[PDB]
């Protein structure tokens, strides 16, 4: 089978600042909650951290040359807040802005459209000291950050995202404690979720008022769960699992309210959303599109002992990636159709990839399993496009192997291999395969 | 995850006579349409045939010892018609009956319940000469065959199946010409399908009248297709693909009629079912259970050029077995629920397996992919049982590697490896894994 | 055995523009029917194309250095028409001419004689839009192209070829649809064949009138078939196979007429050659020599179902190259003697090579099978020379691995390996072997 | 391509007594010229000999079981003269006859038709002492031998051959000195050749007079040479090469005379055929068929220094077997057509095989090159059959690896590997391939 993509389909790759930039104390960068987290024994595997990472702070030119050869149309990257406002609230660090000007200008010079992600988890530690996202003052700190970028990069960037993966930022980080700041409190997770939504709404307003160029949206990480049994309880369990990732952030944005069943669920656990008058109206600020991050899908059943959502994931025996996630691409098809509940909105798959740990052997990285994973998912993308959904682009998760948050450097997601000992980049076999797909603008599955 | 199975769940393996018995001219066996087919240049890969196969005609004792060590409860095998009635119509060949008495007695001696499949494609050539299943005289020849077996093996066998895979017998064999007799005529395929249904109905009547011991049913091979797009045409294409395999044979049996949409579909192609008065009533003879043969699932779309059903199968990029079939177990779950349209009938998974060609290396066959395939499917079986469906047992397709019909010996489906050069049996790693599941009566998926 | 070659024997290698130059949109190059063809899903394997190829547009200096070390005397290359006349008819693109001046001057500086092939399949798309070779206007467009080159490179090139492989240009491309433009119409194939012959004749006239330096000819790809049985029908089948490749283009050129039996053959299929008064006289323009491209030989039999020539090729069990062609060098000896029907004309083996896919292992490409293939064929060349035939030179097909038309980059024919990921050149073992043969001017077969 | 063979086509394998029987002093066997030759330092590679060989004298039952599994129809073997008449002239050794009765009876019991070769080079030393084949008394000794066998095995054998490879017996052995008795004298070679022809004629007479069962013929080894150049001298050189192997023995047999050009050739070298009155008439005794032994083909040129035939063989660069012979099957097709000069006589390919030295690795002998060689030659056999020639059967040269005359055990020609250290037989991959061809009675060449 041959899968022809739309003429204007946007092909790209993506990265996040703390995962690739390696100059954590350079040019006046202040510490983020992630520097703090990684610097804490027991938080990240093997004590790895992003002090050096891929040193993309210094090696951006080579990376951009590589992605220019890839024949890619856009590059999604995140901005390091503590590089712009080291304190989070103080004065602007012109050195920080300069770095991103060097990067963006280079991208533009190379005909690659920057796709800017304002927040990708690196909250300045100073603000966390004052309570972080649990404190509404952070909402103002963020809007200042957003404005600075909107004004500084006006006609240079045409695609913007406020937050990347609100579910991870709020629940994984503050309820499960797996990601910075590493807290484990339901109410705290809810406060964070609510405040980032307000911050998001306000930033879009500013985007509009300043008349900044381009389109702006948010990129939630999406979950998809299917019930093990036909029981209403298993069905409910999957509804909770699915809704907390997307609906909890998208319903307020699109329909002016939080998913009531989840509101009632958390109420039973003693937590309530800190909604002030005017908040929901602010959150409902019209957005141009959303980014969708998809990796896996699960088969769940109701289990009272299965965490705060009482939704147990069944190990169905399916083959998994090197990080342990089963690959089942139908989930992408399913979730994109599910999201039509908000209308046939513009959607960009901002992240899709797999952890395949192959290394350089005889001068190449034979990551056949990454090519396989990607092929299956791109088929689902073509499928939705042909069902009439407005899926506008696809960004391969990870141009480069990087600091995988709590996994450290132990889990590789990149299309370009990075030997952290030498900083040497070696485009994997998936890279050359992808260069073909994006350049031909059509995909082919063969036996 | 741990998956506990029901106390009385029936675990087994299966084979077919022409695929394993290797004494095609021995003890007065007459030729079958398959001997003829395989003996024709270009019909079977590499000119392979079942002249010797696994020589199970002589090696049954070793095989039975091996399956006794497997801790299995039943063994599904087929009876070679041309061994019983070399002519198909003439007098009984006592030598043929004796062989099966040796086999059945041995199984019974070993506490393994025989699960007898009367027809597994080996129609005596003589009958094919007179028209085969296209001629109603064959229906009578079959009933004589069935009676002989019912009377001969009365209190020795408690589970019987009339036909195995009516779809392959009728359409693959007579419309697509891939299997014996290798014809390519729609009307002929429909005649065969209709006459085997009448033969089936009559044989059940005889089973009932003779008061033969046990239960009796039929074992259709099941297909499952999911639409690529949400279009009604793609949906219709899948309905045709699904219904021809099961509904076309099960609706007459359970609801007294053929699927009208398929009746209309074939009518458009100039073919009509040769229904005589009384036929549908005969076909509707109450059966005790059905056997279900499942291997794969597909994503289809409507395509006017895609064969007589105009249903094109999309290559979704999924990993495939060594014969090229993608593995997606959900299909088993889906089809079992779909079949509930005939009521919560007793169902036995009479066949489920995969072509994994691993050979003996360092004394063992490391068929990890077969273990993987099986695990995923057994999970679906437990799932349906827990949804309340009456799935009564599971038979691993192929105790032994064998003559894979048109594929020859080139495609291995067994849990026990057979070196066709030496006839040496080497139980694969999947065998020992299965021995554990069937003996423990519970399965566990682990990372 | 030692095979001493003539003192003035011309040793070389060959390439084609679209196969190696990799700057399809650079310096005003217009699209060719091959850019179009390769850019169409399903036309070329894996969607490969010549956008980059070997990037010889930029790497010619390295290649020329490498072929200078090879000790070669001439280099056969083709000119990209759409680089000279982007439209095919419009004004000259001086940038295009400049490139070839850089190449030719460098060759000349290195004592390597350029052997210029004006047409190697890259017809400007614009002309194809107007009908391509099916339209006589294209004949004029071509003559303008030829003149431009004759005048531009006057005393720089001494060997010229009008067309390379007329059989592929006409029949493979327009009847079988395997090569650009991918048509499947007999009459169209015949029109193309006839118009390229007229174009050829006219261009030789211009060559003569302009007093351009050197010699000029045409290079048909040669076929050779031997009958399976002694039957007249098998004999006729081979005559058709042989004659369409060579006689169909050479008889008009040398004897003023088309092979009548083939004329009658196509007449039976409803096609007739569009011959205008004066055409045959133009086509009969005296040429200095011909180039012969040979790769394989076959054993054929008459078969009414075997394509438009009803000549079936028998798989004799002979070993084949990696692209599936059996190697049997006698065919070269046979065809060269056969061609004596046109007189003892000057013949240059413009192409001879094999697809051997060996890659770089431990720093080298151990292409022993290419050395083997070449040795066998060079023996046949010496043989004909000693039978008194005027075989003047031998050009190894493919200096570099390249874009193999419909095969993509999947089939390697070069003596110098190219890693398309890095553009790195690695001379194969056949290169060093050839360097010895061409430098010593004698070959030795040893046990 | 599929090559269907005739219903009654005779498939077999072949061996020679001294090459496989390993009991040189057992049961009163007298020494042969080959025992003597091999026991001489410098005559056979590594001083190997046939003292033990494959020990088929004791292991015949296993071999026969193996060839019964091969599905073969006939078995060609030779009789050890010094086992029957240890002296060559004295009284019969009943022990010797008994051995062959054990062998023949077993073959017959297994439905394998014995194809008896009376003389396969093992002349009793005693006779060689008296001059061997150079002495006409040997002619009488041979006829006694023949009669003994004809009478002893009357209704047990239906196919007989007098001599196997007269060219090797006469010229290779007496002119070139490569085979026993190792002489190097033209006249001696001619005497041997003439006396074996007289011996042959007389033995056929006895066959006829005794009314022995079956058919009888002779099996010359065939050569085929093609001229390098079109020169009459090269053409003559090939005529000499071809004619000495076949015509020199077949023209006397079929046309009552020796090839005059060869007679004149040897006359120039001072040798003349010792023809007595009545000799040619005796030699012309009508025979039922001939056996043809073919292995290779060559391209020759006239060279005054190239041996007694002044025919030099050119190394064309073609791939060779492990013994150094190039494989080119067309030669079989060519020679069979050439032999039609004697009429469309019945011909059996009594020997065809290749030296491929693969050993047992992981329990098997992966002799793909033997399968390849055989496939190419069987195609030529089908081809001639379809050209209407009476090629009646094919015998694979060497059922077992054996004592390869002057090569010792260093060159393997068998389909069944023999470890001379253990005498263990391991059927090679070619064996299983052949089992399929002979059992299906059709061959298929595939890519």
Residue C112: alpha-carbon gap to chain centroid: 20
Neighbouring-strand partners of residue A427: A416
To the nearest whole Å, the CA of C50 is away from the closest chain A CA by 12
Query: B41 and D444: CB-CB below 8 Å?
Result: yes
What is the CA angle A19-A24-A29, rounded to 5? 120
What is the torsional sign of CA A93, A98, A99, A104? positive
Long-range contacts of B334-339 (CB under 8 A, 24+ apart): B334/B224, B334/B226, B334/B297, B335/B222, B335/B223, B335/B224, B335/B242, B335/B246, B335/B292, B335/B294, B336/B292, B336/B380, B336/B384, B336/B389, B336/B391, B337/B384, B337/B387, B337/B389, B338/B224, B338/B242, B339/B222, B339/B246, B339/B250, B339/B292
CA distance readout (Å), A112 to A8, C422, D166:
14, 22, 82
Q: Name chain D contacts of C317, Cβ cutoff 8 Å.
A: 329, 372, 375-376, 378-379, 445
Q: Which of C313, C408, C391, C314 is nearest to C352 (CA)?
A: C391
Q: How far apart are CA B430 and CA B395, in angstroms?
A: 14
CA distance readout (Å), C106 to C101, C113, C370:
8, 10, 28
Please give the structure tokens belonging to residue C325: 């062609």
Determine contact, residues D184/D175, Cβ cutoff 8 Å.
yes
Q: How far apart are CA B293 and CA B164, in angstroms?
A: 9
Annotated active-site positions of D, please? 165, 351
* Residue A442 touches chain C, beta carbons under 8 Å: yes
Q: How far apart are CA A174 and CA A194, in angstroms?
A: 13
Determine contact, residues D262/D231, Cβ cutoff 8 Å.
no
User: DSSP labels for C188-240?
Assistant: HHHHHHHHHHHHHHHHHHHHHHHT-SSEEEEEPBP--EEESSS-HHHHHHHHH
- Total beta-carbon pairs less than 8 A apart between chain B and chain D: 18
Number of domains in chain D: 1
CA distance readout (Å), D350 to B110, D107, D398:
53, 18, 11
Q: Which residue has the tokens 């099941």?
A: B222
Q: How far apart are CA C265 and CA C186, in angstroms?
A: 11
B337: closest chain A residue by CA: A230
Q: How far apart are CA C248 and CA C258, in angstroms?
A: 6
- Total beta-carbon pairs less than 8 A apart between chain A and chain C: 19
Residues with Cβ < 8 Å from B438, sequence gap 6 or more? B11, B70, B71, B72, B73
Q: In this structure, how many other beta carbons lie within 10 angstroms of the beta carbon of residue D366?
A: 16
Strands C442-444 and C2-4: antiparallel
Residues with Cβ < 8 Å from B361, sequence gap 6 or more? none
Please give the structure tokens belonging to residue D115: 């194809």
Is residue A233 exposed (0-12), middle (13-18) or buried (19+ Cβ within 10 Å)? middle
Please report all neighbours of B, defined by 3+ CB atom pairs within 8 A: A, D
CA distance readout (Å), C240 to C231, C247, D447:
14, 10, 25
Which of B21, B165, B312, B404 does the annotation list as catalytic? B165
Q: How far apart are CA C41 and CA C44, in angstroms?
A: 7
Residues with Cβ < 8 Å from B264, sequence gap 6 or more? none
Q: How far apart are CA A53 and CA A43, in angstroms?
A: 17
Please give the structure tokens belonging to residue B85: 């009635």
Resolution (A): 2.4
Q: How far apart are CA A148 and CA A141, in angstroms?
A: 11
Neighbouring-strand partners of residue C159: C115, C215
Q: Name chain A contacts of C424, Cβ cutoff 8 Å.
A: none
Cβ within 8 Å of B, A 323-342: 324, 329, 337
Residues with Cβ < 8 Å from D380, sequence gap 6 or more? D329, D330, D332, D333, D336
Largest Cα–Cα distance in chain C? 63
Cβ within 8 Å of D, C 38-77: none
Q: How far apart are CA A398 and CA A54, in angstroms?
A: 12
To the nearest whole Å, the CA of D432 is away from the closest chain B CA by 7
Cβ within 8 Å of D, C 374-403: 375-376, 378-379, 383, 386-387
Q: Name chain D contacts of B42, Cβ cutoff 8 Å.
A: 2
To the nearest whole Å, the CA of C231 is away from the closest chain D CA by 8
Length of chain C in residues, anyone? 447
Cα end-to-end distance, chain C, whole Å: 10
Q: How far apart are CA D281 and CA D256, in angstroms?
A: 7
Please report all neighbours of C, defined by 3+ CB atom pairs within 8 A: A, D
Residue B78 belongs to what domain range?
1-447
Q: Which of B65, B177, B181, B69 is nearest to B126 (CA)?
A: B181
What is the torsional sign of CA B284, B287, B289, B290? negative
Q: Name chain C contacts of D369, Cβ cutoff 8 Å.
A: none
Residues with Cβ < 8 Å from D58, sequence gap 6 or more? D22, D23
Q: Which of A346, A374, A413 is nearest to A54 (CA)?
A: A413
Determine contact, residues A411/A400, Cβ cutoff 8 Å.
no
Q: How far apart are CA C7 and CA B436, in angstroms?
A: 79
Query: A71's torsion region: left (phi>0), alpha (psi -120 to 50) or beta?
Result: left
A427: closest chain C residue by CA: C421
Q: In this structure, how many other beta carbons lie within 10 angstroms of the beta carbon of residue A154?
A: 13
To the nearest whole Å, the CA of C446 is away from the closest chain D CA by 7
Q: How far apart are CA D223 and CA D167, in angstroms?
A: 10
Q: Which of D96, D82, D187, D185 is nearest to D142 (CA)?
A: D82
Which of D427, D432, D444 minimises the CB distance to B47?
Answer: D444
CA distance readout (Å), A333 to A113, A296, B298, B313:
26, 12, 15, 17
Cβ within 8 Å of A, B 356-375: 372, 375
Q: What is the CA radius of gyration of chain C?
A: 21
Annotated active-site positions of A, please? 165, 351
Determine contact, residues B27/B129, Cβ cutoff 8 Å.
no
Q: Do chains D and A touch (3 or more CB pairs under 8 A)?
A: no
Q: How far apart are CA C163 and CA C141, in angstroms?
A: 14
Q: Do chains B and A touch (3 or more CB pairs under 8 A)?
A: yes
Please give the structure tokens belonging to residue A362: 């005889």
Backbone angles phi, psi at C348, to 5 degrees: -120, 135
Q: How far apart are CA C31 and CA A271, in angstroms?
A: 65
Please give the structure tokens belonging to residue B189: 């395929």
Determine contact, residues C353/C398, Cβ cutoff 8 Å.
yes
Determine contact, residues B299/B314, Cβ cutoff 8 Å.
yes
Query: B316 and A379: CB-CB below 8 Å?
Result: yes
Helix (H, G, I), strand (E, B) or coil at A209: helix
Query: C316 and D387: CB-CB below 8 Å?
Result: no
Q: Residues of D50-74 as b/e, b for ≥16 C-beta within 10 angstroms?
A: bebbbbbbebbeebbebbbebbbbb
Alpha helices in A269-395 (DSSP H): 279-283, 330-338, 368-386
Q: Which of A28, A93, A19 is nearest to A63 (CA)?
A: A19
Q: How far apart are CA D384 and CA D346, in angstroms?
A: 12
Residues with Cβ < 8 Å from D248, sequence gap 6 or more? D167, D193, D258, D259, D262
Q: Which of A411, A413, A407 is nearest to A431 (CA)?
A: A413
Helix (H, G, I), strand (E, B) or coil at C302: strand
Q: How far apart are CA B40 and CA B63, in angstroms?
A: 30
Q: Residues of A285-324 as b/e, b for ≥16 C-beta within 10 angstroms?
A: bebebbbbbbbbbbbbbbbeeeebbbbbbbbbbbeebbbe
What is the CA angle A416-A420-A421, rounded to 5? 130
Q: Return the half-sphere exposure (C-beta side, CA atoms, 13 A cut-off) of residue C22.
A: 18
Q: In this structure, how many other beta carbons lie within 10 angstroms of the beta carbon of residue A129?
A: 12
Determine contact, residues D36/D121, Cβ cutoff 8 Å.
no
Q: In this structure, how many other beta carbons lie within 10 angstroms of the beta carbon of residue A213?
A: 15
Residue D230: alpha-carbon gap to chain centroid: 32
User: DSSP labels for B249-298?
Assistant: HHHHHHHSS--HHHHHHHHHTT----PPTTHHHHHT---SEEEEE----E
Annotated active-site positions of C, please? 165, 351
Q: In this structure, how many other beta carbons lie within 10 angstroms of the beta carbon of residue A427?
A: 23
Q: How far apart are CA D439 and CA D11, in angstroms?
A: 9
Determine contact, residues A171/A246, Cβ cutoff 8 Å.
no
CA distance readout (Å), B230 to A335, B41, B236:
14, 44, 11
Q: Name chain C contacts of D379, Cβ cutoff 8 Å.
A: 314, 316-317
Neighbouring-strand partners of residue B164: B219
* Residue A1 touches chain B, beta carbons under 8 Å: yes
Q: In this structure, how many other beta carbons lie within 10 angstroms of the beta carbon of residue B61?
A: 12
Determine contact, residues C13/C72, Cβ cutoff 8 Å.
yes
Determine contact, residues B82/B30, Cβ cutoff 8 Å.
yes
The experimental method, as deposited, was X-ray
Which CATH number belongs to the domain containing residue A280 in this structure?
3.20.20.80
Please give the structure tokens belonging to residue D294: 């073919």
Please give the structure tokens belonging to residue C25: 């949109």
Query: B47 and D4: CB-CB below 8 Å?
Result: no
Q: How far apart are CA A166 and CA A222, in angstroms?
A: 10
Determine contact, residues B317/A372, Cβ cutoff 8 Å.
yes
Largest Cα–Cα distance in chain D? 63
Q: How far apart are CA D74 and CA D68, in angstroms?
A: 10
Query: C319 and D445: CB-CB below 8 Å?
Result: no
Query: B383 and A315: CB-CB below 8 Å?
Result: no
Which of A316, A372, A446 minimises the CB distance to B379?
Answer: A316
Bond into A164 cis (ω within 30): no
Q: Which of A118, A120, A125 is nearest to A88 (CA)?
A: A125
Q: How far apart are CA D194 and CA D199, in angstroms?
A: 9
**Packing angle, helices D94-109 and D137-152, rounded to 10:** 50
Q: How far apart are CA C377 and CA C294, in angstroms?
A: 9
Determine contact, residues D400/D416, Cβ cutoff 8 Å.
yes
Q: Name chain A contacts of C48, Cβ cutoff 8 Å.
A: 436
Q: How far apart are CA B41 and CA B46, in angstroms?
A: 9
Q: Which of A85, A159, A68 is nearest to A123 (CA)?
A: A85
**Which of B35, B36, B47, B365 is the mutation pick for testing D, counting most D CBs within 10 A?**
B47
Q: How far apart are CA A336 and CA D281, in angstroms?
A: 97
Query: D383 and C329: CB-CB below 8 Å?
Result: no
Which of D229, D387, D445 minimises the CB distance to C386?
Answer: D229
Q: In this structure, how many other beta carbons lie within 10 angstroms of the beta carbon of residue B432?
A: 14
Q: Name chain B contacts of A329, Cβ cutoff 8 Å.
A: 316-317
Length of chain B in residues, anyone? 447
Query: B386 and A1: CB-CB below 8 Å?
Result: no
Helix (H, G, I), strand (E, B) or coil at A441: coil
Q: Which of A275, A263, A128, A113 is nearest to A198 (CA)?
A: A275
Residues with Cβ < 8 Å from C435, sequence gap 6 or more? C69, C70, C71
Q: How far apart are CA B57 and CA B98, in angstroms?
A: 11
**Packing angle, helices C137-152 and C94-109, rounded to 10:** 50
Q: How far apart are CA A340 and CA A390, in angstroms?
A: 10
Residues with Cβ < 8 Å from A110, sequence gap 6 or more? A64, A68
Which of A1, A228, A387 minimises the CB distance to B314?
Answer: A1
- Total beta-carbon pairs less than 8 A apart between chain A and chain B: 58
Query: B47 and D432: CB-CB below 8 Å?
Result: no
Determine contact, residues A412/A397, Cβ cutoff 8 Å.
no
Residues with Cβ < 8 Å from A288, sequence gap 6 or more? A215, A216, A217, A346
Q: How far apart are CA C74 and CA B193, in angstroms?
A: 70
Q: Which of B72, B66, B77, B61 is nearest to B111 (CA)?
A: B72
Determine contact, residues C372/D319, Cβ cutoff 8 Å.
yes
Query: C383 and D324: CB-CB below 8 Å?
Result: no
Q: Which of D421, D414, D441, D443 is nearest to D67 (CA)?
A: D414
Q: Which residue has the tokens 């889990």?
A: A411
Strands B225-227 and B298-302: parallel
Q: Which of A62, B37, D232 is nearest to D240 (CA)?
A: D232
Backbone angles phi, psi at B300, to 5 degrees: -115, 160
Determine contact, residues A162/A218, Cβ cutoff 8 Å.
yes
Cβ within 8 Å of D, B 124-163: none
Q: How far apart are CA B313 and CA B298, in angstroms?
A: 6
């Amino acid at each position: 089978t041959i899968f022809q993509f739309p003429q204007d389909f946007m092909w790209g790759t993506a990265t996040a600042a703390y995962q690739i930039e390696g100059a954590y104390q350079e040019d006046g960068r202040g510490l983020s909650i992630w520097d703090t987290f990684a610097h804490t024994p027991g938080k990240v595997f093997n004590g790895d951290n992003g002090n050096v990472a891929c040193d993309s702070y210094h090696r951006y030119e080579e990376d951009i040359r590589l992605m220019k050869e890839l024949g890619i149309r856009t590059y999604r990257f995140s901005v390091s807040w503590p590089r712009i406002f080291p304190n989070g609230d103080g004065e602007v660090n012109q050195e920080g802005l300069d770095y991103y000007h060097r990067v963006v200008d280079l991208l533009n010079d190379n005909g690659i459209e920057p796709f800017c992600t304002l927040y990708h988890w690196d909250l300045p530690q100073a603000l966390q000291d004052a309570g972080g996202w649990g404190n509404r003052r952070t909402i103002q700190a963020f809007v200042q950050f957003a404005e600075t970028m909107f004004r500084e990069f006006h006609g240079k960037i045409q695609h913007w995202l406020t937050f990347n993966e609100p579910w991870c930022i709020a629940f994984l980080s503050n309820m499960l404690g797996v990601h910075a700041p590493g807290l484990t409190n339901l109410q705290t997770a809810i406060d964070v979720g609510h405040h980032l939504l307000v911050a998001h709404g306000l930033s879009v307003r500013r985007f509009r008022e300043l008349g900044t160029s381009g389109q702006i949206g948010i990129a939630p990480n999406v979950s998809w769960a299917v019930p093990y049994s036909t029981s209403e309880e298993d069905k409910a369990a999957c509804a909770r699992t699915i809704s907390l990732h997307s609906d909890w952030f998208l319903q307020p944005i699109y329909q002016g309210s939080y998913p009531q069943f989840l509101v009632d669920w958390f109420a039973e656990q003693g937590a309530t959303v800190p909604i002030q008058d005017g908040d929901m109206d602010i959150i409902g600020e019209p957005i141009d599109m959303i980014g969708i991050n998809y990796y896996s899908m699960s088969v769940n059943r109701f289990n009272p002992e299965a965490g705060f959502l009482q939704s147990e994931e069944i190990n169905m025996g399916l083959p998994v990636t090197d990080i342990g996630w089963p690959v089942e691409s139908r989930g992408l098809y399913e979730v994109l159709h599910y999201l039509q509940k908000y209308g046939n909105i513009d959607i960009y798959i901002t992240e899709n990839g797999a952890c395949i740990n192959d290394e350089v052997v005889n001068g190449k990285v034979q990551d056949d399993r990454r090519i396989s994973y990607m092929q299956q998912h791109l088929v689902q993308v073509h499928r939705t496009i042909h069902d009439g959904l407005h899926v506008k682009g696809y960004m391969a998760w990870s141009l480069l192997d990087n600091f995988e948050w709590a996994e450290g450097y132990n889990m590789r997601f990149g299309m370009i291999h990075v030997d952290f000992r030498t900083q040497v980049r070696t485009p994997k076999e998936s890279y050359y395969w992808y260069r073909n797909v994006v350049s031909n603008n059509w995909l082919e599955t063969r036996r």
